[PDB]
Design a protein around this ligand. Structure first.
Ligand code: TAG
Ligand code: CL
Ligand code: CL
Length: 909
């Protein structure tokens, strides 16, 4: 029966108009125009908000069917149901009680997009233009008792202030340039002496709580007030005199008992109550907020929380919410995201060029997540920062709004201006920005911007260099250019700095689109891009491979993230990393770089428990120089641990096992070591495993268990050391000797020299071992163009080559010494022995191995070069042996007949 009589909830039906003349429709708030079905239909000439790097949609004939009216499908991001970028008017009648007359009145709008102007009965009151903070209007003396008509004019266009066309606060890459009001919307009444805002400053070691409160005195004379502050059983009361207007009082509170600190492993929170009581009127205004005791500091060039060494395992949030476009303002929505993040072993979230609503901070407070917030800007491409533009003052005002609203949350641990800044005066601007904030508020750590610039005044550094795949690196990266290994780290680069460093947007490994998730898009955003990819896949006769492409490419994607994350954990005294990402990025051409979809939900190729094995607060790490051995070699490696738990791990023993796929233990041992303290690169022991007893070509799993934490790695062991040119002819060209053998009915193995495959037959496909980087649209075709392999292990051609249906490290040699053959240009019904998964933008049937029948003879075609450096390629010799034993065997009968001249497309002069 209790009610909130001091507020008037404004959520409901508003009279709507896009020209302030036609008021024939009604809109529902909270919500956008798009979430209400209002706006214009998506057309080719839609004035989007964000860059489009690959413009093939507008010009190439393959997108012609998607440029016609009635079938507009856009490939570069999720497509909203409607679009509108301009002024919109919202109107609603309210009834102000008599008891509100002459009192403190204010309007609260949690999220507008973008600029809002308030009118009371046609009289303009003021303007608000916050992107990542609420809109507030002081209505004291401006709103009398009785019926009144509130009107809002919300403008979502980019005008004087361009924060960056790709900023996730406005851009159609993720959140979309919506128009409306979202979140809590209410009128609030307060006594003539009230609390406007509170800055909470807990002192962990001093056992104190300091508060700088902004008090309001609506009287025209001085006011005698009583100020009571309560934190649990501790109370401090204070009587002072308030001058007319705003007042800045500062109070302290001593904590008698022990203080429970806030961190990843124990997110303890305290309740603060601050009340002000006017002595004349007896009216009391009460303010309440949660807070936590924690100190995130840089001690001796290393990140610490509460004097404990800290390591950040983070992922990005780019305001992706396809159900609504605009962000959710409930705690449960964010509780889900933080929960699945922690389920994958993460403790950190970076918000890319936008600030989330209050619920994201409150959820992270109880979860113990470390948040890094940015000020709604990616000042590049379209604009610039630090050159005297209107953006310069906006970022200052936006950061002050963000710290005033959310600065008391313990999860607010780091802050930057935004992402990847541009501007000749941006270094100077960001230097003043970081320096001033470090002086204003020491409750958090500050960095200039994400990715760059490294300023000496930064608390920590954000750098993109310490990662596997750099922009433009392509096939020259470690994962692609060198044989598999797990003994590399970034310790050399980060050793050049006296500041802690956090990786910037690591991973970016792609998966094939998951068409099953298309049913989840029942809201504002529709996956029309997925509809294009799915249609072209079917047009190339591969509609039945959609789920296999998802699972096979996802197994390879998860392998790449494991490699990137373990490389960061092997870097001594690394500050941390920020994944891009755990979830998908639906924009910038379609950057499917996550093991979770745009809804932070699972896809089905890696379980969070398996992700948590290599990405966790305590992770065993194995350093091996290679992963391909013979029965005459000895596995020589080292075992270490990256332990960043709440306390040292009281374990003096590590147990390792080398087991087969069936579970049989080939080797095992126990490593003795001292108790594990907080840090990484902590040695556990050395491994020296002879492999003479390993029979047959085998894939072995090396698992290491430290206490409750276990991690595993794969190695492949082959024999140390089926051919007679009469029976099997292997050649690089279909010459006279090869064509004669096929006329005679013999068997021929065609192995193409690497680089000899002409562009017509698939030479244009730059094949590599890793997954695609970001996406070939945004990168304008950076290598690789492939997404792993797809094969049937039960195929007799692979009987001597251990493998699953998906790509793994033993396939690095195949992907690195080959070209992908476009088999449709030979015969459209050709079934590959080992298929290559092509980029989803092209959906070309690709193959590394296939077989055809040329007359009476049988031909096995291989895009893999089985010629060069075969003494160093142990895994290539094994695959070649498996093929030769198959061809000389009983079950080599190619059914697809083809002519000799049809195969001439594999050669050029
Ligand atoms: O450099 C990067 C990495 O953030 C790209 O986002 C840009 O180069 C875009 O291609 C600019 O359009
Ligand atoms: Cl031979
Ligand atoms: Cl054909």
């Amino acid at each position: 029966s209790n009610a909130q009589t001091d507020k008037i909830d404004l959520a409901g039906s508003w009279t709507f108009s896009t020209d302030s003349m036609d008021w024939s429709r009604v809109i529902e708030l909270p919500g956008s125009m798009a979430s209400n079905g209002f706006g214009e239909d998506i057309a080719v000439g839609t004035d989007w908000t964000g860059g489009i790097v690959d413009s093939s949609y507008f010009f190439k004939p393959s997108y012609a069917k998607y440029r016609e009216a009635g079938n507009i499908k856009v490939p570069f991001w999720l497509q909203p149901v409607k679009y509108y970028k301009g002024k919109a008017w919202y109107q609603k009648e309210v009834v102000i009680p008599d008891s509100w007359e002459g009192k403190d009145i204010s309007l609260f709008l949690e999220r507008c997009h973008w600029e809002s102007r308030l009118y009371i009965d046609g009289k303009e009151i003021g303007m608000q233009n916050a992107l990542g903070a609420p809109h507030r209007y002081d209505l004291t003396g401006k709103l009398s008792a009785g019926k009144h008509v509130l009107m809002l004019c919300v403008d979502n266009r980019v005008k004087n202030i361009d924060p960056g066309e790709n900023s996730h606060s406005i851009s159609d890459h993720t959140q979309g340039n919506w128009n409306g009001v979202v979140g809590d919307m209410f009128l609030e009444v307060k006594p003539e002496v009230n609390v406007s805002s509170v800055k909470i400053m807990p002192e962990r070691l001093a056992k104190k709580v300091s508060v700088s409160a902004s008090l309001m005195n609506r009287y025209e004379k001085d006011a005698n007030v009583v100020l009571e502050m309560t934190v649990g059983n501790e109370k401090v009361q204070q009587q002072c005199t308030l001058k007319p207007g705003e007042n800045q009082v500062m109070m302290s509170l001593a904590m008698k008992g022990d203080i429970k600190c806030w961190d990843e492993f124990s997110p303890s929170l305290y309740d603060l109550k601050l009340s002000v009581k006017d002595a004349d009127s007896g009216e009391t205004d009460v303010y309440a907020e949660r807070f936590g005791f924690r100190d995130v500091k840089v001690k001796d060039g290393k990140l610490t929380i509460n004097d404990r060494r800290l390591f950040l395992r983070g992922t990005l949030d780019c305001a992706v919410f396809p159900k609504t476009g605009f962000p959710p303002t409930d705690v449960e929505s964010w509780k889900k995201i933080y929960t699945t993040c922690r389920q994958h072993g993460l403790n950190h979230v970076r918000f890319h060029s936008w600030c989330p609503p209050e619920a994201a901070f409150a959820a992270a407070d109880g979860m113990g997540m470390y948040l890094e917030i940015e000020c709604s800007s990616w000042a590049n491409q379209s604009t610039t920062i630090g050159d005297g533009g209107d953006l310069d003052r906006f970022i200052w005002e936006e950061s002050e709004r963000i710290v005033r609203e959310f600065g008391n949350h313990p999860s607010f641990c780091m802050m930057m201006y935004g992402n990847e800044p541009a501007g000749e005066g941006s270094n100077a601007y960001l230097t003043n920005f970081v320096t001033t904030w470090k002086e204003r508020d020491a409750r958090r750590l500050y960095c200039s911007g994400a990715g760059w610039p490294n300023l000496p005044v930064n608390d920590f550094l954000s750098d993109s260099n310490p990662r596997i795949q750099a922009w433009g690196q392509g096939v020259k990266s470690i994962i692609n250019a060198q044989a598999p290994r797990t003994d590399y780290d970034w310790s050399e680069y980060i050793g050049r700095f006296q500041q802690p460093m956090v990786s910037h947007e690591i991973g970016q490994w792609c998966v094939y689109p998951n068409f099953k998730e298309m049913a989840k898009y029942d809201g504002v955003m529709r996956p029309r891009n997925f509809e294009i990819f799915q249609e072209t896949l079917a047009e190339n006769g591969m509609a039945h491979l959609a789920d296999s492409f998802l699972l096979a490419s996802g197994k390879l994607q998860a392998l790449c993230y494991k490699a990137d994350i373990e490389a960061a954990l092997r870097t001594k005294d690394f500050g941390g990393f920020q994944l891009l990402g755990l979830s998908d990025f639906p924009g910038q051409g379609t950057a499917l770089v996550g093991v979770l979809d745009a809804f932070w939900e699972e896809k089905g190729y890696i379980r969070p428990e398996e992700y948590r094995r290599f990405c966790n607060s305590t992770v065993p790490l194995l350093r091996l120089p290679k992963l391909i051995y013979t029965n005459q070699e000895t596995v020589k490696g080292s075992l270490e641990v990256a332990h960043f738990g709440a306390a040292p791990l009281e374990v003096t023993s590590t147990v390792w096992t080398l087991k087969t796929k069936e579970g049989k233990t080939i080797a095992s041992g126990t490593l003795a070591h001292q108790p594990v303290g907080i840090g990484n690169c902590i040695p556990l022991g050395q491994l020296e495993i002879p492999l003479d007893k390993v029979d047959v070509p085998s894939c072995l799993t090396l698992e290491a268990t430290l206490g409750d934490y276990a991690n595993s790695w794969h190695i492949w062991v082959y024999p140390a050391a089926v051919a007679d040119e009469a029976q099997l002819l292997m050649t690089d060209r279909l010459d006279a000797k090869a064509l004669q053998r096929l006329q005679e009915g013999g068997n021929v193995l065609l192995s193409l020299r690497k680089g000899s495959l002409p562009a017509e037959a698939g030479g244009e496909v730059v094949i590599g071992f890793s997954s695609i980087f970001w996406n070939t649209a945004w990168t304008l075709g950076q290598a690789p163009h492939t997404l792993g392999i797809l094969c049937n292990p039960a195929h007799p051609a692979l009987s001597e080559f251990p493998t699953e249906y998906y790509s793994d490290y033993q396939w690095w040699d195949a992907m690195s010494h080959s070209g992908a053959i476009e088999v449709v240009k030979i015969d459209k019904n050709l079934q590959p022995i080992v298929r290559v998964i092509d980029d989803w933008f092209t959906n070309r049937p690709l193959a590394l191995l296939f077989e055809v029948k040329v007359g009476k003879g049988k031909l096995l075609v291989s895009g893999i070069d089985f010629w060069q450096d075969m003494d160093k390629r142990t895994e290539a010799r094994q695959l070649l042996y498996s093929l030769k034993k198959y061809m000389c065997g009983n079950r080599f009968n190619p059914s697809s007949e083809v002519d000799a001249k049809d195969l001439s497309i594999l050669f050029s002069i």
